[PDB]
Every structure is written in structure tokens, then in C-alpha cells.
Amino acid sequence: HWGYGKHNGPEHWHKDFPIAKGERQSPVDIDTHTAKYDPSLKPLSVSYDQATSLRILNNGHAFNVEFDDSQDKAVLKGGPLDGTYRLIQFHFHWGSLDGQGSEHTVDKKKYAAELHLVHWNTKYGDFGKAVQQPDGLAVLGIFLKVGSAKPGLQKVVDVLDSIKTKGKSADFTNFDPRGLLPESLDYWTYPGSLTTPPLLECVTWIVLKEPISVSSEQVLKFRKLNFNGEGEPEELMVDNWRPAQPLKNRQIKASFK
Ligand SMILES: Oc1cccccc1=S
Numbered sequence: 001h002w003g004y005g006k007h008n009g010p011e012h013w014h015k016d017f018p019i020a021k022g023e024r025q026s027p028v029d030i031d032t033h034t035a036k037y038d039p040s041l042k043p044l045s046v047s048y049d050q051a052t053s054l055r056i057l058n059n060g061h062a063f064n065v066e067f068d069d070s071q072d073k074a075v076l077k078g079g080p081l082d083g084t085y086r087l088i089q090f091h092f093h094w095g096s097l098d099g100q101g102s103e104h105t106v107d108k109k110k111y112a113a114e115l116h117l118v119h120w121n122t123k124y125g126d127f128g129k130a131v132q133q134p135d136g137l138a139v140l141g142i143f144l145k146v147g148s149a150k151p152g153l154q155k156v157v158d159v160l161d162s163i164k165t166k167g168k169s170a171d172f173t174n175f176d177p178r179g180l181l182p183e184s185l186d187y188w189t190y191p192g193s194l195t196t197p198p199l200l201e202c203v204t205w206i207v208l209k210e211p212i213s214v215s216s217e218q219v220l221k222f223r224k225l226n227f228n229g230e231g232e233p234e235e236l237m238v239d240n241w242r243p244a245q246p247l248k249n250r251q252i253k254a255s256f257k
């Protein structure tokens, strides 16, 4: 099955998931000089005051922090979006080394990691139906650089010990994803896809310009996770990023001059 190795990594995904070579794949390189300012874009509205986290899961490719998405809490709207999109989960993609790990790049620069807050369009009723639609998802993407620690990340870091291996989950309540957001909501946006199989073309990407800083110690703990299950040869969960894909017939819009 797919993964991030020599024999099952991103260059192989197209055999099981032919949309890998589709017209709106992600990630992409954001060429900052080509991305045009769009003064019609609205400020992004991130309303996370009532977010209810449930659980954290090692799914064998990343860890997901999952939310209660059964009520109208934790919503993204405005920006490029029509309507309201509900937070279901966040996860990260990260490197074996500080010099790589992000999926989007900015003028070819790779950050150490990238946070994806995944939201589904409420008009489609749930996540499963939303991923069948070209406007089903909105992913807020946030870069991570290594420097100062992010205090609001530490609760996540500390639970990772308990989900080392594929299939492990742990209760994870009362986590506030507002502590993972930079000051500015200035963003780039374009139409794309999930960055993991099934690579569905449902996503309005909203990539924040301003990175967050995390410490070396915090990212080191991400790199202690395992892609394997308990009782299997250890393969560290590192370099779970898809590289940049062809832009094809797309424009990247900037919310800011
Ligand atoms: O990596 C992903 C996994 C699953 C669902 C939605 C979005 C992304 S980027």
C-alpha cells in the first residue's frame, strides 16, 4: 500500500490513484512574484472558540488530531470561500531534517513542516460527501520553521509517546487549535487536492504567509513517531511530504499586497 518509501512513495501513487497526474494536484510551489493580489478576497474568518477535540490518532502516515464535527463549531469562512466549512481534523507533514518537510514551497523554499487544518463544506452534510465535490474541502495550511517553541503545540508533542505506532489512538480533549495560528491571516489561495491518496481534487487551499516557529525539540519528537505498527521493524515517521506538483492551468491569488 502507499507510503513514502522508495517503492511506494509519491512517484508510485499514480498507479493506484491515477488522479495523481490530474489537473489540480497539490502541493505546488507558490511563486510569490507571480501570485496576484486579489482585492476582492475577504479576510479569512477563523472561528475556533468552541472547537472540541476528541482524539489523536497515528494512521500510519501522520497523526490526526480529530474534532467533533457534529455541531456548528470550529468554522472557517470568508477569504476565498462561499459558505461555511467545519473543522474535522488537523495533521502535519514534516521532514527528517529541518531543511525539508513542508509540502507547499514559497519561491522553492521548503519549511521544516506544514500544518493542515482540514475543514468540510457544510452544504454537503459530512466529510464523506464533501470529498466527492470540487468545493468540498478547505485546508488551512501553516508553515513551521524551527526557532522558538510554540507553547500551544506542546500538548500535542507530549501525547505522541502514546501513539508511537500505526493504529494507536489516545483521548485528546480540550485542545485549542487557536494556539497553533500565527499573528497574521494573510494568505495565498488556489484550487487543489488532498496531498495524500486518494488525492481527491476537492480542496480550496488557503496557505498562510506567516509561518509559526516551533523548537528543535518539538519537531524532534514528531520524528520519533513510527510509520509501522507495534511489533514491526521500526521505520521512523519522517519525510511524509509530497513534493510540489505541476501548476497546470491554475492561478495562485494573494490576499495581501
Ligand atoms: O493529507 C491530508 C489528508 C487527509 C485529508 C485531507 C487533507 C490532507 S492534506
Ligand SMILES: [Zn+2]
Residues within 6 Å of the ligand: 091, 092, 093, 116, 195, 196
Ligand atoms: Zn495534509
